[PDB]
Amino acid sequence: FHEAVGEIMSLSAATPKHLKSIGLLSPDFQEDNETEINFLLKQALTIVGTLPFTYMLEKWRWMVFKGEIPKDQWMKKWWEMKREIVGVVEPVPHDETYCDPASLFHVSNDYSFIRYYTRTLYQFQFQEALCQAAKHEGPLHKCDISNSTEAGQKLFNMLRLGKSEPWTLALENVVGAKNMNVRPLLNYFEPLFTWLKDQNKNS
Numbered sequence: 276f277h278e279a280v281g282e283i284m285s286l287s288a289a290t291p292k293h294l295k296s297i298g299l300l301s302p303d304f305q306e307d308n309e310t311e312i313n314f315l316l317k318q319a320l321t322i323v324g325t326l327p328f329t330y331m332l333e334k335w336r337w338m339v340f341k342g343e344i345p346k347d348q349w350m351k352k353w354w355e356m357k358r359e360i361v362g363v364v365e366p367v368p369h370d371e372t373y374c375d376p377a378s379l380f381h382v383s384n385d386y387s388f389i390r391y392y393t394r395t396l397y398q399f400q401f402q403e404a405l406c407q408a409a410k411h412e413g414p415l416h417k418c419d420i421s422n423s424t425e426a427g428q429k430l431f432n433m434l435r436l437g438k439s440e441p442w443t444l445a446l447e448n449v450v451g452a453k454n455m456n457v458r459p460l461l462n463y464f465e466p467l468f469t470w471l472k473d474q475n476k477n478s
């Protein structure tokens with residue numbers, strides 16, 4: 276929750292609407308659909324890039340800790356999972372002597388990694404929610420929650436809650452749902468999704 280709340284503010288502030296309203300961006304600057312596509316793809320290379328990697332890493336760690344993977348089949352299973360979840364193949368073969376996942380900082384320093392997954396969703400579930408109280412009409416990526424007191428009050432109703440109540444109840448106070456949902460992310464990236472589908476006709 277902490278990082279999602281921190282991140283939605285930056286997501287809204289980076290919009291060209293707030294930039295042209297703050298004076299940094301000249302008012303005589305109309306955003307072309309090409310620039311919107313470029314910005315969406317730059318965002319996706321981070322947001323949608325990290326999701327399969329995070330999910331695969333956490334699944335491998337859970338399967339190791341649960342004993343489903345034998346100690347002599349770790350790297351085999353790891354590079355098997357990476358070839359069908361992340362879609363990434365190792366350039367050179369690795370035996371059980373390697374510990375490639377341990378080369379990551381969060382693995383060798385004993386940090387839970389699933390946090391970076393849910394945080395990627397929650398923010399969008401927040402953002403898509405906060406644009407409803409802000410009465411946004413256009414695409415989600417152009418939404419700005421500024422100047423709208425209703426969205427701020429809806430957010431604060433959960434912010435003041437803290438840990439006193441279950442996180443599901445906190446979600447229902449903003450997104451109106453008890454379980455995490457991925458539909459806001461797809462709604463956010465739909466303009467990029469259509470363009471990507473159109474660009475891959477022959478590939």
Ligand SMILES: *[C@@H]1O[C@H](CO)[C@@H](O)[C@H](O)[C@H]1NC(C)=O
Pocket residue numbers: 292293296297419421422
């Ligand atoms: C919010 O209100 C201020 C005050 O009039 C205005 O300057 C600004 O353009 C409005 N919109 C945004 C996105 O800041």
Ligand SMILES: *[C@@H]1O[C@H](CO)[C@@H](O)[C@H](O)[C@H]1NC(C)=O
Pocket residue numbers: 308309312
């Ligand atoms: C932007 O819209 C124009 C008008 O339909 C179109 O010709 C152009 O291909 C579009 N570009 C992108 C990146 O969507």
Ligand SMILES: [Zn+2]
Pocket residue numbers: 278281
């Ligand atoms: Zn932070």
